[PDB]
């Protein structure tokens, strides 16, 4: 079962969505690259 | 007083040292607790070979850090 | 902990807004980490 | 079997230190064999 | 396969764990020692 | 077709045994036809 | 160049415990490259 | 310049037929002018 | 030295099946080195 | 020794098809070593 992106990045997905970043596939993509860092994925999301 | 990790192969050993013990003391101190004789122990921290007549603290070896041990000769 | 229990407050809002499909809603909500705002946007495109 | 998964723990630390550029980080990390300590140094001299 | 970072991964790591951060130097040293960390170390400590 | 590549596995063994001198090692190995066993003996007199 | 020329013979000799290069080349030149022959040479002179 | 070099291909044939004695071989070959065929015959009677 | 002196001739003779060295040198000395002549000699004694 | 003494001449004679040693030496001794002369001798006895 271990694991599953929605479950794994729950807390982060929430913050991103809280900031207007609604695109799941983009968010997961960004977050995997930042190792789970919201701070990092944010930066990624703001430049593609 | 400092407390340092030692590494070889897939081995570890802990040792106690006063900050201003020589590196030669530090070597004896390992030896006393791991076998490998002083004259065979080549010690590497932070890209440098630790030389015998230098203070352990001259290398700024912090508490809880690993100093590596390459056995030689 | 349990989806119905976990997303109660949100499921309610979605259903109020006419989004009656449970499976879709839970799917949407898991993806948005529970954000109604986000799941809405998701539901409105797939 | 895949950089984001392979260097997860390290990517996180780098990102937690403000090093947001994925491509650079993976490059630096491959070169340091996964050592954060080493990739950091690389990243700080554009030896990467 | 057939790619230095992949090929000398385990060694590169040990070198880096010892403070030897210069990639090009390490690969150079490792190629010469045939992969031996023990040998590359010695190389790196005199050029 | 290049000594470091050709004698890689042997060079490694020699080096773990403390035989760090590349030119010596290749010299010893060419003479032993690639045999570590042989190059060793050579290096210890050689 | 002897090491290159008698490479795979030198290997066999070395893989039988005959580590002396000069002796091996000497023996091999005489046997015209034959391992079989050089062996015999090495076992008496 | 040099028997081993001069009679290389012949020496090899002789050796691969079991005729291991270098001095005998060269002696035989010099007499047969290089002919393996001839030196063989010589070696089989002295 | 006969082997050296009659090398190219000894080879031809041997390559015609005339393996007896002493006979060949004998025949060649008599023919002044002529293979053609030593041949003829060898074919009648 | 005739083979050694008349080498160069024996060769020429053999080169011209005169393969009989005894005849050649006989002819040459009479001509004092002259090929030209022994030839003539050999062509009539």
XYZ file of C-alpha atoms in Angstrom, chain E residues 7-39:
33
model
C 29.729 3.798 -12.100
C 31.588 5.236 -9.100
C 28.500 6.037 -6.997
C 29.488 4.171 -3.854
C 33.064 5.501 -4.041
C 32.078 9.062 -4.894
C 29.938 8.973 -1.805
C 32.724 7.878 0.473
C 35.074 10.500 -0.907
C 32.450 13.187 -0.479
C 31.759 11.840 3.056
C 35.474 12.498 3.742
C 35.367 16.077 2.435
C 36.604 15.406 -1.045
C 34.030 17.427 -2.918
C 35.807 17.947 -6.283
C 34.064 15.702 -8.809
C 36.535 15.912 -11.665
C 39.414 15.289 -9.271
C 37.658 12.309 -7.671
C 36.736 10.671 -10.977
C 40.307 11.263 -12.191
C 41.706 9.728 -9.018
C 39.262 6.813 -9.118
C 39.899 5.952 -12.760
C 43.571 5.699 -11.923
C 43.016 3.501 -8.904
C 40.553 1.367 -10.884
C 37.752 2.188 -8.531
C 39.696 1.733 -5.240
C 38.683 4.364 -2.663
C 41.778 3.491 -0.691
C 43.967 4.310 -3.694
